[PDB]
Amino acid sequence: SFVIRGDEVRQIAPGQTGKIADYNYKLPDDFTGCVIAWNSNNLDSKVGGN
Amino acid sequence: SALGKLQDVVNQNAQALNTLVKQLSSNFGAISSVLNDILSRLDKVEAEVQ
């Protein structure tokens, strides 16, 4: 589990590339499993920036 | 004229090897017939399908 921005969720899949897949969290090509994601703006945003 | 029996055995084996080598120029529906070229144009999972 982790927090990312809404543009980045497509990098969390087998064989992908880009800043998150490159430098933060990499899935294998032989990945068996499920990727579950949801918007958390109601908790994880704040005025002036979280 | 009579040696055509032995020359035909030489010719048939040469045509069969030239055909086998010429078939490396074919795409078979892939983006390129060149294997390094595919690996440069596409990322891992898309290259694997080609």
Side-chain angles (χ1 to χ4, degrees), chain A residues 2-20:
Chain A
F2 49 81
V3 183
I4 52 169
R5 80 178 217 243
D7 283 335
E8 296 177 317
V9 179
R10 62 173 55 80
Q11 303 187 18
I12 314 303
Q16 298 290 63
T17 56
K19 290 173 178 172
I20 301 306

Side-chain angles (χ1 to χ4, degrees), chain B residues 9-35:
Chain B
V9 175
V10 177
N11 291 356
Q12 280 197 58
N13 285 277
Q15 180 59 253
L17 284 178
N18 291 348
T19 294
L20 181 71
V21 177
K22 282 286 298 181
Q23 282 287 68
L24 296 174
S25 305
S26 300
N27 288 355
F28 312 106
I31 188 170
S32 182
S33 61
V34 180
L35 183 53

